[PDB]
Amino acid sequence: KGEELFTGVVPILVELDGDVNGHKFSVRGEGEGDATNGKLTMKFICTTGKLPVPWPTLVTTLVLCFARYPDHMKQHDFFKSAMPEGYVQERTISFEDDGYYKTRAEVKFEGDTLVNRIELKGIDFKEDGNILGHKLEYNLNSHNAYITADKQKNGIRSNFKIRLNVEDGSVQLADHYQQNTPIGDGPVLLPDNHYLSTQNKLSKDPNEKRDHMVLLEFVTASGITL
């Protein structure tokens, strides 16, 4: 049923309130989602001034319901099946030799808009680290992420590592532990094991005078044969 809501192009609103080592900030994002092509186009603004962390560390936090699930795997799309009531997405993100993010989000429909509302807390970061020091390159490599179900919580989980590019050419790992639980009571599809493949293009708007990120993202599911 919830799959019906994603047959067309859907407007997206993202709202994040963050706090990293006492440095508070807010991000607002708007764009559109095209789940038929697994395509996502967004622009994000730091509405409080200067973003105190690098934009690439926030990409995974800032709507997997827009992944392209092939016909052979619609009976396993948890993210759309929990719609329109939506789901809670929680994550811990451990940055190698540095601090952690802990995030809680609700993803749901508000009217005709898909809304992702996030609270983020950053803890134990080094003011000389790559994060608070803004020592990361402005990009994000393509990644694969393995999705498994947790029938004992009526949800799904995922663990995956992001390899962030550092300005000196080194790589800094960001280990993601993710849990999704539906907001409503109704039944949801729990899936067999599968993968989501993601490609990300980060860019800038030359007329934008605020701290910002333009994002083009493709997410496609695979790993189950009919």
Side-chain angles (χ1 to χ4, degrees), residues 2 4-151 154-225:
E4 289 186 301
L5 292 162
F6 294 90
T7 53
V9 177
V10 178
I12 305 169
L13 170 68
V14 179
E15 305 187 322
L16 179 145
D17 281 351
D19 186 341
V20 178
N21 279 30
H23 316 301
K24 298 184 184 295
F25 64 95
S26 283
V27 169
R28 187 185 186 97
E30 60 91 26
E32 303 276 323
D34 187 356
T36 297
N37 308 325
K39 180 176 60 61
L40 183 158
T41 57
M42 302 280 302
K43 177 176 187 181
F44 299 93
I45 299 284
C46 179
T47 59
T48 49
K50 179 183 269 79
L51 191 67
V53 296
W55 281 106
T57 72
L58 295 183
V59 173
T60 58
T61 297
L62 293 169
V63 289
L64 297 179
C65 46
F66 291 105
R68 188 194 194 185
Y69 269 77
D71 298 67
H72 47 270
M73 328 169 61
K74 317 284 242 212
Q75 45 275 356
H76 300 90
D77 193 340
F78 161 88
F79 304 108
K80 298 182 191 61
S81 84
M83 293 301 167
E85 305 83 11
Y87 52 83
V88 180
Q89 179 158 297
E90 294 171 286
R91 279 209 194 98
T92 298
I93 305 176
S94 309
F95 293 89
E96 187 173 31
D97 293 292
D98 213 331
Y100 308 70
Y101 293 164
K102 273 186 172 182
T103 67
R104 185 191 190 276
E106 296 182 24
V107 184
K108 61 187 187 291
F109 272 98
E110 295 174 14
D112 58 0
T113 303
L114 192 280
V115 178
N116 181 18
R117 214 173 259 109
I118 310 143
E119 296 274 5
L120 177 150
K121 302 171 115 277
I123 303 123
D124 288 338
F125 284 92
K126 307 174 178 172
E127 290 284 346
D128 297 303
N130 298 330
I131 304 315
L132 283 177
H134 299 272
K135 300 180 192 178
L136 294 184
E137 294 194 344
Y138 186 68
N139 55 56
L140 192 66
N141 299 335
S142 302
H143 290 89
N144 267 4
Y146 197 55
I147 310 303
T148 70
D150 188 75
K151 305 182 307 247
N154 188 38
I156 71 184
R157 321 225 308 167
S158 184
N159 295 315
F160 60 92
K161 287 188 182 72
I162 299 287
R163 303 163 52 73
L164 299 160
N165 294 315
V166 188
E167 291 276 0
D168 64 359
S170 61
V171 171
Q172 180 169 13
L173 290 175
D175 194 4
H176 290 59
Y177 304 159
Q178 174 181 334
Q179 305 91 29
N180 293 69
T181 61
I183 291 180
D185 281 347
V188 300
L189 309 176
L190 301 203
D192 295 328
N193 290 13
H194 61 295
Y195 285 97
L196 294 181
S197 291
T198 314
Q199 295 83 38
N200 308 107
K201 180 170 182 284
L202 282 61
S203 67
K204 301 288 191 180
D205 173 13
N207 284 125
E208 183 53 71
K209 285 200 67 67
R210 290 159 306 167
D211 211 338
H212 78 284
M213 170 175 65
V214 175
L215 180 60
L216 173 68
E217 171 170 307
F218 292 94
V219 189
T220 311
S222 50
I224 297 185
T225 302

